[PDB]
Amino acid sequence: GHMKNILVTGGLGFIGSNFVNHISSKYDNVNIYVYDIGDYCASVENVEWNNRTKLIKGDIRNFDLIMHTLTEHEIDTIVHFAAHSHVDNSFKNSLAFTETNVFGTHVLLECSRMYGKLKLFFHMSTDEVYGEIDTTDTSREVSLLCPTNPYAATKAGAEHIVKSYFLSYKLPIIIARCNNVYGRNQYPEKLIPKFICSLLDGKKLHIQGTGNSRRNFIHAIDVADAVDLVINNGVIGETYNIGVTNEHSVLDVAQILCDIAGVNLENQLEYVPDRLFNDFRYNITNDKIKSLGWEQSRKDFKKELVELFDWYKVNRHRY
Amino acid sequence: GHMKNILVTGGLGFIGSNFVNHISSKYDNVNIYVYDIGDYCASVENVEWNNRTKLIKGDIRNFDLIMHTLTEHEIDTIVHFAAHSHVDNSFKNSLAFTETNVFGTHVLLECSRMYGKLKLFFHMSTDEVYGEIDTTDTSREVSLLCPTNPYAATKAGAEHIVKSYFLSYKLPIIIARCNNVYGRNQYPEKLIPKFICSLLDGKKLHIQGTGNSRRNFIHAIDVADAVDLVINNGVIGETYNIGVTNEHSVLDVAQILCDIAGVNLENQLEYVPDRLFNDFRYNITNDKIKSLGWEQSRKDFKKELVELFDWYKVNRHRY
Ligand SMILES: NC(=O)c1ccc[n+]([C@@H]2O[C@H](COP(=O)([O-])OP(=O)(O)OC[C@H]3O[C@@H](n4cnc5c(N)ncnc54)[C@H](O)[C@@H]3O)[C@@H](O)[C@H]2O)c1
Numbered sequence: 004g005h006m007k008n009i010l011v012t013g014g015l016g017f018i019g020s021n022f023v024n025h026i027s028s029k030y031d032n033v034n035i036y037v038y039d040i041g042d043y044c045a046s047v048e049n050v051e052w053n054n055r056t057k058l059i060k061g062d063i064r065n066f067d068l069i070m071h072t073l074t075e076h077e078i079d080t081i082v083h084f085a086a087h088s089h090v091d092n093s094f095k096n097s098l099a100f101t102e103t104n105v106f107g108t109h110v111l112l113e114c115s116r117m118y119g120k121l122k123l124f125f126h127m128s129t130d131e132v133y134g135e136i137d138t139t140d141t142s143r144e145v146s147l148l149c150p151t152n153p154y155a156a157t158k159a160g161a162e163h164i165v166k167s168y169f170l171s172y173k174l175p176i177i178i179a180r181c182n183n184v185y186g187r188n189q190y191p192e193k194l195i196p197k198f199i200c201s202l203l204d205g206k207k208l209h210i211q212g213t214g215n216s217r218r219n220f221i222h223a224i225d226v227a228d229a230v231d232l233v234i235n236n237g238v239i240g241e242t243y244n245i246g247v248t249n250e251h252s253v254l255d256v257a258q259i260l261c262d263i264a265g266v267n268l269e270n271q272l273e274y275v276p277d278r279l280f281n282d283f284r285y286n287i288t289n290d291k292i293k294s295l296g297w298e299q300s301r302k303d304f305k306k307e308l309v310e311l312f313d314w315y316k317v318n319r320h321r322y
Numbered sequence: 323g324h325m326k327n328i329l330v331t332g333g334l335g336f337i338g339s340n341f342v343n344h345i346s347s348k349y350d351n352v353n354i355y356v357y358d359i360g361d362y363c364a365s366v367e368n369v370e371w372n373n374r375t376k377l378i379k380g381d382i383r384n385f386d387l388i389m390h391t392l393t394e395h396e397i398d399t400i401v402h403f404a405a406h407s408h409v410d411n412s413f414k415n416s417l418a419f420t421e422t423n424v425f426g427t428h429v430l431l432e433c434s435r436m437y438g439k440l441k442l443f444f445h446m447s448t449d450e451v452y453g454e455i456d457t458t459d460t461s462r463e464v465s466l467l468c469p470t471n472p473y474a475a476t477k478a479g480a481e482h483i484v485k486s487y488f489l490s491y492k493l494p495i496i497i498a499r500c501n502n503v504y505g506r507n508q509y510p511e512k513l514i515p516k517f518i519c520s521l522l523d524g525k526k527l528h529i530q531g532t533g534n535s536r537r538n539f540i541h542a543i544d545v546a547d548a549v550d551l552v553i554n555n556g557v558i559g560e561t562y563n564i565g566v567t568n569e570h571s572v573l574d575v576a577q578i579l580c581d582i583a584g585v586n587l588e589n590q591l592e593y594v595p596d597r598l599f600n601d602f603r604y605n606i607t608n609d610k611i612k613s614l615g616w617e618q619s620r621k622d623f624k625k626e627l628v629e630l631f632d633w634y635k636v637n638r639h640r641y
């Protein structure tokens with residue numbers, strides 16, 4: 004399309020690698036620079052490497068390496084997936100979220116502003132944030148709801164700065180928000196792959212608290228397609244929600260995976276301490292992204308988890 | 323009320339030193355730990371040193387020094403004024419706002435959470451941030467408007483993190499927002515003291531852009547009083563506006579200070595580049611603070627500036 008050289012931050016990770024493999028198989032003209040710090044949730048084997056795919060090892064906070072990359076590889080598009088992932092009950096956990104999600108995003112934006120040649124800065128965000136739209140003008144966000152935990156506050160803070168680069172300097176940003184993603188290439192510490200891999204290794208499923216927490220789950224293939232559509236067709240400066248209706252509690256998910264595994268839910272569940280923080284996901288609409296022509300292609304959650312269960316059976320040794 | 327041992331971040335700066343002197347003068351049994359990095363806008367001469375006031379030199383990002391200070395000095399209250407001030411048109415300027423305003427605030431909140439014995443975390447913010455309430459009667463903020471520049475974006479980011487510590491962990495936070503403050507102890511780089519010191523040093527007044535940008539100006543004595551009142555009587559978790567009706571353009575202010583200096587406006591004014599970013603300030607009310615029993619004691623702007631002009635004549639050699 005209007006993409007020749009793209010910098011995919013976090014391209015060794017779960018969503019980043021799914022996006023990189025989608026672009027490399029759809030658009031054989033596009034040079035893809037995977038920019039990634041290579042931490043434990045990352046894997047070279049997530050990406051189908053070819054003569055278009057190159058790896059740059061670095062932190063998004065590395066101003067000088069980023070400036071070198073944008074100028075020397077003539078980057079037209081940043082696709083920013085490099086957000087912090089690891090949640091735990093230990094002191095300073097949320098600080099790493101601010102350092103990567105707020106400060107790291109900000110370094111990328113300022114580099115982009117100094118470079119001055121970007122055609123698009125695509126920022127990936129989550130349903131931890133709820134953008135309220137102008138009742139006058141539904142293309143326009145006026146406010147974000149107050150996050151209830153510091154993890155979610157770093158996501159809101161990142162979105163405010165990204166948008167401010169467009170409103171102040173005309174940096175060409177687009178933000179997308181996504182539900183919880185499931186699919187191939189996810190390190191098994193998030194619910195679905197952790198439970199699948201636990202069920203494959205004979206072990207019990209850790210239920211934090213009551214197991215009544217609810218998420219919406221969207222397939223990685225539907226996400227990769229939505230991002231592709233928004234990058235190529237989206238209105239610069241706008242935010243796109245990539246939501247589905249596919250809401251399950253933690254216990255609902257345990258039930259489905261136990262059913263797929265041929266084992267009884269009761270005697271698989273071990274109850275474990277709750278997270279210490281307020282953990283609220285928003286139902287986000289998908290009307291704007293549908294008007295771009297996006298259609299959810301993986302609607303049968305049960306059927307997709309059967310396939311993914313078998314994918315981890317073959318591939319989990321990778322992690 | 324509750325204040326015995328207080329940690330005042332940025333207490334060598336403009337608003338912080340005015341607050342320290344106020345607490346020292348009004349109470350006789352509050353120990354004040356002035357916590358400050360000693361940047362060029364700070365002065366030890368700003369503080370009236372006594373038996374109850376001690377300087378700890380430190381960055382608010384210094385987790386281990388903060389943790390030693392909270393625990394060994396049995397701090398009950400943090401009064402957090404250490405925000406980044408220095409605006410210019412230079413690359414990377416806004417990055418230091420994220421490091422101090424977002425990451426620094428977050429270090430203080432996480433230290434406070436780990437310490438577990440704070441009675442109050444007071445966060446000083448600005449009229450660059452505006453929030454919307456749930457209902458007139460409950461007056462709880464449920465959203466922040468989207469900021470139009472990255473400077474304001476960092477102030478919004480800080481407020482989201484501060485509030486989330488109350489909402490997730492019951493950290494006892496109060497936020498206050500302020501108009502532009504004027505008074506003693508300000509480094510001459512903000513409008514009023516820069517113009518007063520330029521008039522005294524016989525130099526030209528720099529008008530950035532058109533000089534039609536407007537601010538509201540509140541006296542530091544009125545701000546220190548409001549912060550004391552909010553700390554002792556405010557509802558934990560809420561935000562309070564500290565803000566008068568005292569609106570003036572840059573050119574309105576230049577004219578008042580030229581009149582006071584005994585000089586003609588024409589021939590004092592040099593026109594210099596505008597700031598590169600979009601800056602509009604939300605008009606705030608002071609009803610919530612009036613209900614706690616605050617009353618603006620310094621209402622006569624020109625009268626206060628005549629006195630402030632006199633104070634810089636005597637004391638500006640400090641800077
Ligand atoms: N996974 C989900 O369910 C979900 C839901 C909504 C949207 N998102 C968004 O998707 C993006 C990626 O999520 P994911 O699940 O694929 O995560 P992941 O942890 O699998 O991938 C993140 C990648 O970024 C890299 N990284 C981390 N910090 C970095 C830094 N400072 N510099 C450079 N590289 C760094 C890691 O090495 C990793 O490869 C995030 O921006 C997040 O906001 C996540």
Ligand SMILES: Cc1cn([C@H]2C[C@H](O)[C@@H](COP(=O)(O)OP(=O)(O)O)O2)c(=O)[nH]c1=O
Binds near residue numbers: 197210
């Ligand atoms: C990984 C995991 C998650 N959970 C719960 C915590 C959350 O309510 C939910 C999803 O957690 P997780 O997959 O970590 O996702 P998120 O980043 O959206 O919080 O599953 C468990 O109960 N046990 C587990 O082993």
Ligand SMILES: Cc1cn([C@H]2C[C@H](O)[C@@H](COP(=O)(O)OP(=O)(O)O)O2)c(=O)[nH]c1=O
Binds near residue numbers: 531536
């Ligand atoms: C310091 C200064 C400010 N200004 C303008 C910039 C702003 O529009 C206004 C106030 O600036 P400033 O005092 O820096 O306050 P704020 O942090 O709220 O921006 O005065 C000048 O025109 N010349 C100057 O020399």
Ligand code: NI
Binds near residue numbers: 072
């Ligand atoms: Ni190179």
